[model samples]
Target: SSIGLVERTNAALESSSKDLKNKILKIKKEATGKGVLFEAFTGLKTGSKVTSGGLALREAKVQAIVETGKFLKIIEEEALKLKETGNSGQFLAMFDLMLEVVESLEDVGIIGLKARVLEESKNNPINTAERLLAAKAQIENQLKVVKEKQNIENGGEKKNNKSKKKK
Candidate 1:
């Protein structure tokens, strides 16, 4: 859904490394204060550790942006070298790593570029990690309700089976 966000963020990083680094620093300061520096993003590991209660949703989102920004900077630098050297083997290796980073960014939910876009389409597009966290909570709540409904239906069926056996 936020593919556009990811595309735009990636594009912005492609344009300016200095801007990327500065913005990341700004966001990191905001996130950390205003935080153990979760290793999930850098490690491309599962997001099970980054829970809603463990950190402020806003802080998590900010960290996601900072991490994604740094990751993209690395990717851009690698791309530049691979292009100059024309090394197919190295290029493919880098490509695989790029895909992993992108997927991890998606899982953490902060690949969107430009905070304006992030702020503007926040509710509608699920573009930021804050929105994703909210969405996940909503979904989990609904699923719990669904599970309860199923239990009720199963209990009704068992009662009916008992009545039939008595008859």
Candidate 2:
């Protein structure tokens, strides 16, 4: 389930990246005062900070964006595997849940980016890291649930086969 959901989410994210890039570009173009403030907040060159930011607020924003991209990539790869194995309802359900989680992460990434741009506070990075860690835990938990469901399904099938053989 998580595997499938992760895959779909990844595919969606990949598709969304183009849009994200455009948005980022647009923001950079209109940066003006905000850009100057952001630069001052982090004390980094505008070009470097815009591209990937660094270890400051800009860096944190960039890291979140990049990490979200990586998450999407990983989900897509995993989805392909599920696709090859054929459809399983359980897998589909899991994927749906995973999509929700990915979406949540996406929201966090976007919010973090805006916060950085606003130069709100230094606590953002810490908060973002904590949220990401929690998301990861949720993903792991979902995977475990999916595995348990699959095992149960397989076990039931095996039992039915045993009954047929006894007959």
Candidate 3:
């Protein structure tokens, strides 16, 4: 019963994490698109005017990013607890992936926001749209790698259990 509970909790956490990731990605995309629109409309690379609009958007985007990151971290902590109690290698791997994603998001948020603020103030809007695009790409790549690892771990676990039963 304890094992079943852990499994169910893991499933719920995983589902929540995935949902949060999707929402984060959607928001990031929208922010990036907005940044592009701002650049096109202002005709100012990095200056006071660009800074005005960029600052507001950056704040909003960062807030969303931070909140989503917090959720990922919480899920990771829970996964780590489950790993400890269940001695589940799969859970450990998932936790590691979650950690990686969290770190990546932090890096993206920090660099992206700083560049926006700095460049906008200088009147050299450092192509925030491109930076955001790159960040999104990195996130997508990490997510894919983690998902693949999780799948492999699950498959291996199933095969091992089947062999043990046959013996």
Candidate 4:
């Protein structure tokens, strides 16, 4: 006997996902690679030189360099992160697809830390409104696929089963 509708549906979803990730990863890889290259181009494009007497502008130049270094480090990780996206794209095939990847883990970690309002319960990770929402939202996409699979498997996905008891 051949596979059922659920299996075929999953197979189809799985196939299409590869299509999406392949395209997304391919583009991001090329685009982010340009970020580092973009820095080089900016160097070539040259900007007006600043002078000491141009106090604010000159001082701003120093601040800009310092801040840009930090910011550059932050953005530089995008290249590395995109590598993982591509890896997952190749291997995982489909995913919740990591709704919004962490641009700055340090930044997000700190925010999650500060917002960990009630330390009373320790079950959920990152107990913060700001961070928690982002974490929770990633599951939204996964839930759609999972529910679809479940619905086909058992005739219903059992949504809203949270408050109800199962026999």
Candidate 5:
């Protein structure tokens, strides 16, 4: 019914908090580990906002976590169903995905390994920095594209009301 794995995975993937990576760190601590990661990440933009360790980087990190969790969920379910690597492209594909996700997480340093015995980062160094850096601009672009793209779909009438002068 309730599993630590599932719980933490969901926790790491909340919604859109300002400090998503840190939020996940809290979640991971509440669940993940207590040995060798996080600090610079939590202290990333300590009291900062949009500079080096703020929104953009947080978004990128969260995005990676969210995507990784998606595949992790599948891996979890598949793992439960079929304990060992079976004979099919399905397991292999999932394995590849897990590896990819791990690498991606590493890029941002938001990794969670089963055998790991240390606290993890809310992010990485280079790749994480890059991911966060890119996210800010990308998110801005995404927001910038929010337009009323179809005001022409108006098959309605206009307000023909007139104001009276003698009240």
Candidate 6:
């Protein structure tokens, strides 16, 4: 059962990677097509000589991808160790670290749907949309599953109490 949680977390990460890839594709497509939207999406000025056919935009995407890879790789390796050792405390510790990392990004303004994406992307053009989307999706999905399970369990407890009252 404990190992199953690890499997589920890994599965969530896989979906996160998919989301990153899809966003990259869309970014590229927008850059290739109507460039105004691309500029709006990435908060980078388009059609300048420095930008040069969206090269800088793509470079930002690559840098963001590198950050994403670095983040996911550690989680993947640590999760494998957890599976091998069965240290439940270590498992919780890993989750705490993950939460902290996610929270830290928000604190510094690198992760968000609109404002931070525009703010950070304008300054550094970090492609943070994909980065934050995938990372938060991975973290939030796990939390959502845990909370849903707790709610169901609590509801079951209430049902049992009502049944006892009927008896």
Measured by lDDT, the strongest candidate is 3
Off by over 4 Å in 5: 1-54, 84-100, 111-167
Report lDDT per candidate: 0.41, 0.39, 0.44, 0.31, 0.35, 0.42
Worst 10 residues of 6 by lDDT: 107-116
Error of 2 at 134 (Å): 28
What lDDT does candidate 6 reach at residue 32? Answer: 54
Candidate 3 lDDT over 48-164, as tens digits, reads: 564454544544445555565457546534543443345434443452344333544442332222222333324632223323333334444544443343343444211333356
Better by lDDT, candidate 5 or 4: 5
Compared with the true structure, model 5 gives a TM-score of: 0.28
TM-score of 1: 0.30
Could you tell me every candidate's TM-score relative to the true structure?
0.30, 0.27, 0.39, 0.20, 0.28, 0.30
Which scores greater on TM-score, model 3 or model 5?
3
lDDT of 1 by residue, 110-161 (tens): 3322223234334465323333334334423432343343343444211333
Q: How close is candidate 3 to the true structure, as a TM-score?
A: 0.39
Predicted candidate 2, C-alpha RMSD? 22.9
Global CA lDDT of candidate 3, please?
0.44
After aligning candidate 2 to the native by TM-score, how far in Å is the CA of 159 from where it should be? 58
Report the alpha-carbon TM-score of model 4 versus the true structure: 0.20
lDDT at residue 59 of model 2 (Cα atoms): 35
For residues 8-126, could you state the per-residue lDDT of candidate 2 as single tens digits? Answer: 55533445544543444433333343433443432354355553432233333344344445544465455455544444543444344344433443322232222222232233332
lDDT of 6: 0.42
Each candidate: RMSD to true structure?
18.4, 22.9, 21.1, 21.4, 20.7, 19.8
Q: What does the lDDT come to for candidate 2? A: 0.39
Higher lDDT: candidate 3 or 4? 3
